Amino acid sequence: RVKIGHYVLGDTLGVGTFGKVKIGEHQLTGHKVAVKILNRQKIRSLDVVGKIKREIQNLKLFRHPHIIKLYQVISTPTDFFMVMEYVSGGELFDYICKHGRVEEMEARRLFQQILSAVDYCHRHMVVHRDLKPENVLLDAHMNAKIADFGLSNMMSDGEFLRTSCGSPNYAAPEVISGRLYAGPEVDIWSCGVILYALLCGTLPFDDEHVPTLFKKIRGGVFYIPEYLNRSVATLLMHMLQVDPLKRATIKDIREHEWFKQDLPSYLFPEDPSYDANVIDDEAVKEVAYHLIIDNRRIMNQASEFYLASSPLKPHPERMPPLIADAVKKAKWHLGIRSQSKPYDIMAEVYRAMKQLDFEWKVVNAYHLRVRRKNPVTGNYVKMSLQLYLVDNRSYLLDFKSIDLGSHTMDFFEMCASLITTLA
Amino acid sequence: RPTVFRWTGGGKEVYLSGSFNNWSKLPLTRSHNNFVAILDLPEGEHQYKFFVDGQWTHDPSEPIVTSQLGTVNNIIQVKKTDFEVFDALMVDSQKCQEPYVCKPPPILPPHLLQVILNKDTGISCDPALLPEPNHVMLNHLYALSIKDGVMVLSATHRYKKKYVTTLLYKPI
Amino acid sequence: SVYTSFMKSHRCYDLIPTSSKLVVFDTSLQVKKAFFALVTNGVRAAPLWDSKKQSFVGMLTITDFINILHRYYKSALVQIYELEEHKIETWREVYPLVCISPNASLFDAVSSLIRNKIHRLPVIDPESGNTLYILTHKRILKFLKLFITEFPKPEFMSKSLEELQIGTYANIAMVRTTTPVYVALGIFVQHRVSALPVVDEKGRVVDIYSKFDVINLAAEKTYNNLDVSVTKALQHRSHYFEGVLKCYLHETLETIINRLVEAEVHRLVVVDENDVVKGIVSLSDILQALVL
Ligand SMILES: N#Cc1c(O)c2c(-c3ccc(-c4ccccc4O)cc3)csc2[nH]c1=O
Ligand SMILES: Nc1ncnc2c1ncn2[C@@H]1O[C@H](COP(=O)(O)O)[C@@H](O)[C@H]1O
Ligand SMILES: Nc1ncnc2c1ncn2[C@@H]1O[C@H](COP(=O)(O)O)[C@@H](O)[C@H]1O
């Protein structure tokens, strides 16, 4: 008879992307919990030992009404027990199957809660890359419950993601192509199809042949039924845009007319009922609570004092255009370019570091982590080099900074010395 | 201080005997293919062994020991650092420079092409103001075409919860 | 009263905009290029970085551009060799860094602005050594404006300007409508004032010539002919945006502060019953009165 900390284990609810989740009932009371079980032997061979640590440190700090809460994590000499919140409504995928489609009155509500949960994750630099109606759980009151992170990852400043994970469907065009992506724009794409599957009942990109399926996704062409109104139609085409730069963001969706209707004001950070119903980020820093919170809302609602606008009265300090020798404004470009062989470029930057005395380690055939010691301050100035591919017969060398004088200036002076001594 | 004894082999019924049971046989509960039993064991080394369908058998993967008489049983070492999550991950991460090179390509991500210094801000706000930069364009160097011997560099860094795009006019 | 205890609470960090642009010059940069760079980047002033000693040494502002012009200007027939040849490092020889931590109070900011008689203060993070933002008077007063309805209103805000005696009302530096720019630039150097109200023969203010209107000589590259009148230099904006701006001695302080933050200018011209001058209430005058 299996007991793990007052909880008795029962039937398996299912096996996730990592680990087996099974229901647990309190021995004395009957309180139901879901216990995800992680084998310690699986973890070391996958080298995900550091990735489980990250997911645990983040899931225990999460607190959203539409995300499965983690109550505690029990450690055993052979396995880890992640006891968490239990819901009885089952998968959303099974709810879309029970009914034909979902009424837009209810489909809107479920979509809002889900995107709320997504937003919360992106604000904590966590991107859940396995968003699907199989991972959206339901409770007794038909509320959304995002779960099964596993394929989730953190977002660092100036760092892209590489891993092509998720279902064949629901996956962004740049994921199935194995390209580099930012993070958030992928979760919006999986939410687009989730919105489609919620309303239509079927999938926008579906084919028995997997190569032909990827062809449809990259093509980004899907059938829009006529029982979908003009309003919600525009939103879907915006969320499922192929080019990630044209694709909608969470702020874009939140301003959409179909989304703003019947929207509860407790779901989003700058909504009227948020500053009084949700404990924010001033909890860790601290009449004192209300005073600090009030200070932020004043600074927040002054969007023209902290953030620039986009194309009234001209600002007094606005500069006139510099006259001829008006001149055409110069354009800024990324790093430096070349059209020679990739091997020639790396062979050229290698001899370039000899003349400047750079110490460096090789992480990849196109990723160098260089380092120079500042002769004046004594500090070490290091940066990141990465050769990319542009168009067809074009290349680009990228420069990235790594954390008595000034670090920003040190990064600039080190780049300039390398750029000058490089053809 | 729990401890998980799982039997992965086949069988209609599996027992567990060890020093804890005084080598008596403890009935294991069955799932689909797993025979498991969680006990409360102190810190140290404990000798255990399974009994499946009639024959004394041990788990091949688990470390063994010989009691100077041919008897071979499994050995589990219940450490004190097995009951703390991070202290167990530390022992699982600890158990898991300046080169000259040697040299024995990814497509450019379209996000780094959104130059922040090339977009207008509308003649309504302070000239020093800029739009909020993407988190992935941070720390990346942007430059201009050199004109009359002066090189101009720029990058967007982050301090606390703010963003400063610094430009450096530097003659060469 | 409660205004002083306010600025002792808020750090300088609360003034820094979420995203901003910070031009920086190397000391070895040719000074002429540095002045053009200020025009192209839309920035009013830039921190100076001495590459040799690896530390910020000061600021380059439009005042420096006025100093260079006034010091070396023979005529419109001969070019200004030094302005074309000098470097930032070399000019600083012919003519200490004042900064502040972002974690320092907003009260220390206003204090450091007055004690050092400067208009722009470089906010430098002591942790990373990097420069973050350039603090000004317009930035500070506009910040307090966001909280004049949060922090209770003291008694003096309802008082007239004549009662509070705020600003300068003696020996007001002015220029004529036909006053050459060089002569105007000389007034900027001698009396060290931010702006010079322009007056006609009748004695009324027709226009105002600030220090900001001088870089327009570097923008249009008309800096080699300083013999032209001050009106000719204000012709580029004479057709649009104006303007004028002024106040009275009977107007309340609150009405005046509201007038400054709205027009986003540094000063008002205190006129009489007509358009003739009577005094100048500056932003440095108001901030000084809400600290002492
Ligand atoms: N997949 C998987 C998996 C487990 O089931 C367990 C188990 C386990 C085995 C069986 C049971 C069980 C036993 C009787 C009835 C129901 C059960 O879920 C509970 C937990 C303990 S550690 C572990 N590690 C795993 O990777
Ligand atoms: N045109 C002017 N003539 C005389 N004094 C002035 C003038 N403009 C400003 N002031 C005074 O100079 C001091 C600093 O002002 P500002 O240079 O505008 O910060 C204050 O005492 C002002 O009242
Ligand atoms: N009282 C005023 N009336 C009209 N224009 C002004 C006034 N004060 C400043 N300006 C203008 O505001 C711009 C910035 O000057 P400053 O306020 O000195 O930074 C310049 O174009 C000035 O001519």
Author numbering:
A (entry chain C): 10 to 295, 322 to 346, 363 to 376, 396 to 473, 532 to 551
B (entry chain D): 78 to 173, 189D, 190D, 191D, 192D, 193D, 194D, 195D, ...
C (entry chain F): 27 to 121, 128 to 324
Copy text from the publication.
AMP-activated protein kinase (AMPK) plays an important role in regulating energy homeostasis in eukaryotic cells. AMPK is a heterotrimeric enzyme complex composed of a catalytic α-subunit, together with β- and γ-regulatory subunits. The α-subunit contains an N-terminal protein kinase domain and a C-terminal regulatory domain. The γ-subunit contains four copies of a cystathionine-β-synthase domain27, and we previously showed that the γ-subunit binds three molecules of adenine nucleotide.
The first of these to be reported was A-769662. Initial attempts at co-crystallisation with A-769662 were unsuccessful likely because of the relatively weak binding, poor solubility and the presence of additional, non-specific, binding sites that promote protein aggregation. Utilizing the crystallization conditions for 991, we were able to refine conditions that gave crystals of AMPK in complex with A-769662. Although the diffraction data were limited to 3.9 Å, unbiased electron density maps clearly show that A-769662 is located in the same binding site as 991 and how it overlaps with ring-1 and ring-2 of 991. The two activator complex structures therefore confirm the interpretation of our functional and binding data that A-769662 and 991 activate AMPK through binding to the same site at the interface of the kinase domain and CBM. While there was no CD change upon binding of A-769662, this compound competed for the binding of 991 to AMPK. Together, these data establish that there is a single-binding site common to A-769662 and 991, and likely related compounds. Compound 991 binds about 10-fold tighter than A-769662. Thus, by promoting this CBM/Kinase/regulatory–fragment interaction, 991 and A-769662 enhance protection of the activation loop against dephosphorylation.
